[PDB]
Amino acid sequence: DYLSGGNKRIPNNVDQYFSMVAFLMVRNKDNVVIPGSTIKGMVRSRLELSVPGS
RNA sequence: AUUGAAAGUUUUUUUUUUUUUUUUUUUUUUUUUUUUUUUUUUUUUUUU
Secondary structure (H helix, E strand, C coil): CCCCCCCCCCCCHHHHCCCCCCCCCCECCCCECCCHHHHHHHHHHHHHHHCCCC
8 A cells, every 4th residue: 555655544454364363273384284293292191191111 | 733724505586377167957747635424312382
């Protein structure tokens, strides 16, 4: 908008996309992904709490 | 005390001059600082 020449009155980014301000989940190229580190940590926690001699 | 003698073979003269141990002669010709080595492992973006 011509360097926002003293208007600042259009919704612009609000309506251009469909993502409000929130806590973003980790995703790769618009594909939601569960981190491998998270899965490994969960598995290790389960194994430690389950295996007796851990 | 000889026939019987008293005389320096001496004075004087530079073995000196002319002549560069000199000219030419590159301590160089060759030799890859390479060569084996994964910036790797451990860690749940998360609670009253």
